[PDB]
Amino acid sequence: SAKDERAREILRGFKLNWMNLRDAETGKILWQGTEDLSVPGVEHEARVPKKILKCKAVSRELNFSSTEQMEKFRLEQKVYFKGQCLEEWFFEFGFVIPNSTNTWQSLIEMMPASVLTGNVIIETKFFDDDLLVSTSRVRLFYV
Ligand SMILES: O=S(=O)(c1ccc(S(=O)(=O)N(Cc2ccc(Cl)cc2)C2CCCC2)cc1)N(Cc1ccccc1)CC1CCNCC1
């Protein structure tokens, strides 16, 4: 199918270059990285500071490249605790220019760290509109 082939083309041309999280209130950097966590088929890992769990809101910046044009680039992210979905987040970037590099700022808005750590999976789905480009997993440790 044409839609399957396009999804792979977009996947093929897609790269996450760097990313970070800040406390929304203070603007202070909780975490940053250049590990491409979008990469499917691999269980990624990330160590975040436990104080992030007390933030009312977190500001995330992503920087990505795409060789392919996308009309409605967006993400669905699901927070699993021991295999149980606890929340779902939706973010929309919109139109992506072919061969562009883009910064995307999104705002994200309770068990203790010690219970959560190692038991939280973030499952991220990359879409162009209804077309599923990629599915990726990150296990979180809180330190
Ligand atoms: O601090 S969090 O653990 C968290 C922050 C940021 C992310 S993320 O989506 O921005 N990101 C996952 C991710 C981002 C982009 C991509 Cl492409 C792939 C994966 C990770 C976080 C650590 C490294 C990057 C996921 C989870 N936490 C998620 C959560 C919700 C309910 C119960 C437990 C945990 C964020 C909330 C923020 C508001 N205050 C309460 C916690």
Segments of the chain assigned E as strands:
14-23, 29-33, 43-48, 58-66, 70-81, 84-96, 100-108, 120-128, 131-142
Please report the sign of the dihedral spanned by the C-alpha atoms of residue 36, residue 78, residue 7, residue 104. negative
For the chain, give the residues followed by a break (C–N over 2.5 Å).
109
Q: Are 81 and 137 in contact (CB under 8 A)?
A: no
Find the 10 Cα to ligand 1 centroid distance in Å. 25
Q: Give the domain range for residue 36.
A: 1-143
The CATH number of whichever domain residue 97 belongs to comes to 2.70.50.40
Q: Are 98 and 68 in contact (CB under 8 A)?
A: yes
Atom of ligand 1 nearest to the CA of 58: 37
Could you give the angle at the alpha carbon of 99 between the alpha carbons of 66 and 74, nearest 5°? 35
Other beta carbons less than 10 A from residue 113's beta carbon? 19
List residues bridging with 107 in a β-sheet: 59
List residues bridging with 55 in a β-sheet: none
Q: How many separate domains does the chain show?
A: 1
Q: Whose CA is closest to atom 14 on ligand 1?
A: 37
Q: Hey, which of 30, 48, 122 would you mutate to test ligand 1's pocket, going by the most ligand atoms within 8 Å of its Cβ?
A: 122
Q: Quick one: resolution in A?
A: 2.6
CA distances from 110 to 58, 87, 113 (A): 15, 12, 9
Q: Whose CA is closest to atom 40 on ligand 1?
A: 53
Find the 1 Cα to ligand 1 centroid distance in Å. 34
Q: Whose CA is closest to atom 15 on ligand 1?
A: 37
Find the 83 Cα to ligand 1 centroid distance in Å. 16
Q: Is 133 in the pocket of ligand 1 (CB under 6 A)?
A: no
Q: Whose CA is closest to atom 12 on ligand 1?
A: 122
